[PDB]
Amino acid sequence: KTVVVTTILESPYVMMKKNHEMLEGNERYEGYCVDLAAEIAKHCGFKYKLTIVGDGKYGARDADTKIWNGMVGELVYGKADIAIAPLTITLVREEVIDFSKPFMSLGISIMIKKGTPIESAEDLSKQTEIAYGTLDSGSTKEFFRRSKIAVFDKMWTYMRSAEPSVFVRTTAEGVARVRKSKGKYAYLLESTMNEYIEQRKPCDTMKVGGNLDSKGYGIATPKGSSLGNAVNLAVLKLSEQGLLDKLKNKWWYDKGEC
Amino acid sequence: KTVVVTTILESPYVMMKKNHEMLEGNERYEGYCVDLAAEIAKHCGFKYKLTIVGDGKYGARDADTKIWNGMVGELVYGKADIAIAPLTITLVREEVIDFSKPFMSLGISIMIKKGTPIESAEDLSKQTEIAYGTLDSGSTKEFFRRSKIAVFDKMWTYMRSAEPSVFVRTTAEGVARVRKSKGKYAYLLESTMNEYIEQRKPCDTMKVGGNLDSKGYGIATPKGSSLGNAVNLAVLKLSEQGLLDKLKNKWWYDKGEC
Amino acid sequence: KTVVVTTILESPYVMMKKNHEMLEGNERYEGYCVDLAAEIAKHCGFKYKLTIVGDGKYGARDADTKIWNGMVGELVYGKADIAIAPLTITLVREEVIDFSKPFMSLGISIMIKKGTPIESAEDLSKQTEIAYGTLDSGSTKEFFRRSKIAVFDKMWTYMRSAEPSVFVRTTAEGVARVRKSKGKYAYLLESTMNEYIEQRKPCDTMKVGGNLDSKGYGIATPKGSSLGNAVNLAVLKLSEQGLLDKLKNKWWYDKGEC
């Protein structure tokens, strides 16, 4: 039984392998999460099909509709057997899907175009010149939507009324937006992505500040999926074998272009 | 059946005719909106009675009570069939009443007694010496109250807290307050009134800076009224036949005194 | 359902990005109306497909055939769910389609090559040296065609009978013609496009005089469409949150080249 892995195009976790669009199969993709999926499938002894979540969303439960979209939805509604993505372990997702132990640590972080007078979330919150937003339908946005933390809950008050929307559809759009914004837009996103981008040409962005929180990417499987246990042990195996570090190095730093 | 037209004594939209005491019914009044109402009535083929809004207000929803006052309330509660007044098309209002397309454009503008060291909203927001307020129960106030724009949020933060109240009940009061404040009061009001006032003796006020927002006056009708369509088309007709411009010229600039 | 947004390639409202040779769906497009469509959609919470009106016309009822072309037609004949375009609210159009409140004001204005012996429509109406025309199949043409106003009537009389046609198929054609005409052609186009063009290199054109009239672009939906309401409310929300002015700034002025 081929495990349907839901994942999302998000560098460097999962990326079309240059010139593999026209291709098919898992080999098309590359990235930390593709390798991870590999080491996971190998350690759990399963065949998997990497599928890119249709709506290209990580997963959020639509308010009112209550319907999970993105990779979470995939798992929740049985469209996918497992999500091997920079899928943030969050409480609201862990209620509806299972998460392996984190295979990666990240925090919400601020990406700014280099030179933006922003050193912290506080800075962002304390000012108006510089818009900032998050991926919509992602844990970051939810982090802010939900945070009682005075500075975030506020950053949210701003972001949620912000217009144009400070929310971007994709990390690339946030990043593009930061780059295109002449520093007038700060993108709140996961330090791992932020760190990846920081290391990619045009190298005009950087992570400033520490992370606004600490979380992890877990491999998500549907609630009570039998894969969960295997995958979880796999992740831990992988972690202890230094594979995750090896992978993170491979995908973040070994290709550093800055 | 005689259309009850709610309107508001607001120059030069609706004004008691110099005599007026010797006149009855519609003929008491003259002004852009009286003329507009005449042509709207003629073009929608209804007989109407101009009636001034009891509370002389345009209309805002009372927080807590959620009751609408002013012309909006007159429509909302079925005291009037139509509002033909410089009634600003706003989101909260369009939610409870219908507006023809705007028959007049306006923006929130600043009226200052001539010679006030203010050239913009940013200026007012940046200082404390010159008070500034808007008509309460009006769209200008609601604009600031609901504005997320840094400068206006600041301004609203100030105005909402200003003591004594920077808000006025009538434009006449705001205008008087400007004229009497020796430049210590800037009146945030709609450019149309501001322009009109600018052009009337004592010619001591002026609009400064551009409009803070762009909006329109719409002939309002109760949500889902039949008149709405007719009135809307009549407004478009009147607009296109140049009547609106002819009326605006007649009432704003033909009478100019400065 | 995915709302089908008809709109028109008209800078800066809707324009092909720059690599629209590598993007799909809505991201191929950029511009004020593209941004407008996005927030409109985000606020009305619908998915949309931007689709450029086939005939690249705005909408005019073909005399004799009585068939609406352009985006009006697209809406009138059910090909589009909504037009998010510099579509002029006009009487004839509101008779067949629904317009939101205007999301942008404009007036018919005269674009002349900078330094053209023209300062007004009266000026144009008085002379024959400077040809002037409008966009054909536009509200601007129809304004003149249908104008009862002596001057615009004379101008119409002139334009309709001017040879070669003073009318142009596109704004670019009109603009090019202004430029190429060494100032012997005045383009009567909406102030907004006039202003946009003014702001674009070669900066050889300018809006002269006031507008001949005042109208707005509204987001159009088929008559009695459910969307109309939400979109109208969206437009108002957006307008009040300063979005439309931000967009206007972003697309007109923030890239100003003159």
Ligand SMILES: NS(=O)(=O)c1cc2c(cc1Cl)N[C@@H](C(Cl)Cl)NS2(=O)=O
């Ligand atoms: N940085 S940290 O060690 O304090 C830290 C780490 C994690 C925290 C919280 C904190 Cl304060 N949350 C967990 C979530 Cl998955 Cl429930 N992940 S974590 O990276 O181990």
Ligand SMILES: NS(=O)(=O)c1cc2c(cc1Cl)N[C@@H](C(Cl)Cl)NS2(=O)=O
């Ligand atoms: N300039 S103005 O305020 O007098 C003005 C504005 C509009 C008018 C007419 C006039 Cl006279 N027409 C409407 C059309 Cl949509 Cl029926 N639009 S408008 O910009 O609000």
Ligand SMILES: NS(=O)(=O)c1cc2c(cc1Cl)N[C@@H](C(Cl)Cl)NS2(=O)=O
């Ligand atoms: N300044 S502008 O022309 O771009 C403009 C005009 C109107 C906007 C917003 C903007 Cl940004 N909002 C609408 C709503 Cl208030 Cl009914 N009216 S408008 O005058 O056509």
Ligand SMILES: N[C@@H](CCC(=O)O)C(=O)O
């Ligand atoms: N990793 C995030 C997506 C990126 C973000 O939200 O910043 C998630 O699972 O929702």
Ligand SMILES: N[C@@H](CCC(=O)O)C(=O)O
């Ligand atoms: N036209 C405004 C009143 C004037 C103002 O608010 O300044 C309204 O409809 O509320």
Ligand SMILES: N[C@@H](CCC(=O)O)C(=O)O
């Ligand atoms: N916006 C216009 C087109 C341009 C023009 O007519 O000048 C319309 O809706 O017809």
Ligand SMILES: [Zn+2]
């Ligand atoms: Zn390969």
